[PDB]
Write a protein that binds this ligand. Sequence first.
Ligand SMILES: *[C@@H]1O[C@H](CO)[C@@H](O[C@@H]2O[C@H](CO)[C@@H](O)[C@H](O)[C@H]2NC(C)=O)[C@H](O)[C@H]1NC(C)=O
Ligand SMILES: *[C@@H]1O[C@H](CO)[C@@H](O)[C@H](O)[C@H]1NC(C)=O
Ligand SMILES: *[C@@H]1O[C@H](CO)[C@@H](O)[C@H](O)[C@H]1NC(C)=O
Ligand SMILES: *[C@@H]1O[C@H](CO)[C@@H](O)[C@H](O)[C@H]1NC(C)=O
Ligand SMILES: *[C@@H]1O[C@H](CO)[C@@H](O)[C@H](O)[C@H]1NC(C)=O
Ligand SMILES: *[C@@H]1O[C@H](CO)[C@@H](O)[C@H](O)[C@H]1NC(C)=O
Ligand SMILES: *[C@@H]1O[C@H](CO)[C@@H](O)[C@H](O)[C@H]1NC(C)=O
Lengths: 81, 226, 312
Amino acid sequence: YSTGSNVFQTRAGCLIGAEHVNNSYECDIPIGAGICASYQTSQSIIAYTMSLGAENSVAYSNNSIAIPTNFTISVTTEILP
Amino acid sequence: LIANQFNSAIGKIQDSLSSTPSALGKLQDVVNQNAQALNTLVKQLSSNFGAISSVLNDILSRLDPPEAEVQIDRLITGRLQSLQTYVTQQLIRAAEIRASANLAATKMSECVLGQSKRVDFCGKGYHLMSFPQSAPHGVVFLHVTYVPAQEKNFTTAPAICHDGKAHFPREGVFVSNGTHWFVTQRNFYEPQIITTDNTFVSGNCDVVIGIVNNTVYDPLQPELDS
Amino acid sequence: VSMTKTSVDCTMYICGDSTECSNLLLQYGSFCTQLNRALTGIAVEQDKNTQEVFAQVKQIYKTPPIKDFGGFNFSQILPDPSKPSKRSPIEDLLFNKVTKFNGLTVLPPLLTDEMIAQYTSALLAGTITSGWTFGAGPALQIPFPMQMAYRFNGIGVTQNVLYENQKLIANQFNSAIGKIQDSLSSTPSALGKLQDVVNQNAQALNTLVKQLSSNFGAISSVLNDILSRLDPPEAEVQIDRLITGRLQSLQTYVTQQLIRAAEIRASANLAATKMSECVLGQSKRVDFCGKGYHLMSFPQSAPHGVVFLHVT
Ligand SMILES: *[C@@H]1O[C@H](CO)[C@@H](O[C@@H]2O[C@H](CO)[C@@H](O)[C@H](O)[C@H]2NC(C)=O)[C@H](O)[C@H]1NC(C)=O
Ligand SMILES: *[C@@H]1O[C@H](CO)[C@@H](O)[C@H](O)[C@H]1NC(C)=O
Ligand SMILES: *[C@@H]1O[C@H](CO)[C@@H](O)[C@H](O)[C@H]1NC(C)=O
Ligand SMILES: *[C@@H]1O[C@H](CO)[C@@H](O)[C@H](O)[C@H]1NC(C)=O
Ligand SMILES: *[C@@H]1O[C@H](CO)[C@@H](O)[C@H](O)[C@H]1NC(C)=O
Ligand SMILES: *[C@@H]1O[C@H](CO)[C@@H](O)[C@H](O)[C@H]1NC(C)=O
Ligand SMILES: *[C@@H]1O[C@H](CO)[C@@H](O)[C@H](O)[C@H]1NC(C)=O
């Protein structure tokens, strides 16, 4: 794809065919240098800075503790050659 | 309830393995890497490497042995280099797989054959069990782990000042629901009345920062009174 | 944790803009394709190493606006808003201490130094506020003196000791952090491992570039002079000799890179294990995390690596 269709410049290199969005999303296709691409919504390929996760501040207070009341017995699968 | 959670967890393992095609990506990648290595080694026979032909039978049939020897030597250099590259790549891959097999043996010994306190070694959470499951050229572990789920805020105090002597939780946490103070397990909210049995006294109320005033029930007193 | 993410264009390295050398290379088989595959595997492995070491946390945590941690001072390890890049003072000195286009490319890392510092800050905030609970479930708030009392309980010292020595312990922790600060500031070989990795990769690359300039038994090292001086018949054999030399040199580079990447992956797995068992929990393994009975650990992102401040 030559130039002239959603040309976007990132630190990885020239990116053609994806639109640069200002929002932050989980990384889907690792373009590089912190930029990921994904197929989102009509439909087009988007490029964005990856979102490391929901920025939640723990309500720390020198006086308060949080003890869980219920648990879950979760089974995790781990594959090893 | 724990039995139902465990059974549903196992069923979800089966469903997730069934539906997801990339569940066994590690083993499939190992097999694919080996297949690609063998395929490259086999396809290396088709390369001339600078000789007149890639098949040495045709070289011997066509040219006289004196001048054919240099072409056969070129073919030998090329194929020997290809074999050397394949063997070196296989040695490095065997080092990777031996590291992974030592890790798998360690996981077997420490999680199937016991309970491991190493964090995130066997499952995300407080590890409970682990079940090996044989897989083609590999092993699959079903790490049964304990994960807390429903948490609620509480007011905590490092010590309870009673009779001027600080009381500390023997094996628990001091928490309050605003009005009353309780000593509680660390990982599961179970409030008990503060008592000399679950608290060990050591020190004075002035030293501790954040100590709070409260009364520690003494089991002995009712027997004396009655 | 990770080594420089480099890729080498085999066809461009062995032969420049010339097409005759490319034709002579195509008859060597799939050597260049295999070398490119190996180098790309190494690059993706470096990205996986950094991911596995740092993205141990599910959600980016954040410290409270006011740092009232019972006297424990984390200013040297927590990010400072003043400087443009939110790196801690210790992270700043770690980054300060550590200090080619013949088909040679250096692919940028997938995780920018800024988001690596963001993972490090999230791990620090979770460790400070929630203790080790943020690695085994939902992050669970707890006052830091209480968390360090639990760590004392872990090492076999009853929590009496800390609450009765909170001021002295806080001063000792702050002074230890400050002395770590100054010892990193002064000693030149403090960050020897990361600098050794960087220097080794740079020396390998420079060796490859110099090997571009070797005769390898040919008439001359430069390609165009070989092409001009000789007719196509003898040019073919001279180019074949030069191709064998350059291919052997690049294969040596790729093999050494594979071995070095295996070593770096072993170190990155060790770093991931240290993060999991010492930042996300308190480990009873002896001498695994610091000389002494382990209390905590603080990750600090360093160029192409990680630094642990094992509080013992
Ligand atoms: C702890 O969690 C379990 C589920 O993880 C709860 O059990 C469920 O309770 C709901 C009530 O709305 C029922 O509809 C479900 O059938 C129950 N079982 C399961 C497997 O979901 C349990 O009540 C919780 N305990 C506490 C004290 O909150
Ligand atoms: C994204 O943010 C930058 C900086 O504020 C701004 O210049 C740009 O217009 C924004 N793009 C969109 C699509 O809003
Ligand atoms: C605890 O309190 C904080 C602020 O008061 C709040 O953000 C948090 O959600 C509370 N925790 C729970 C479990 O409600
Ligand atoms: C706290 O728990 C006690 C249990 O003994 C109960 O009597 C009291 O009403 C509770 N108070 C609040 C504010 O939840
Ligand atoms: C918590 O900090 C507040 C801030 O002023 C202070 O008033 C209070 O005494 C502190 N409590 C503990 C237990 O440290
Ligand atoms: C706790 O009670 C004692 C008397 O029993 C009193 O001297 C002290 O001031 C009280 N502490 C607080 C924090 O009110
Ligand atoms: C923590 O240390 C820094 C310098 O190391 C100092 O500026 C700051 O005031 C200290 N914090 C407290 C609460 O004393």
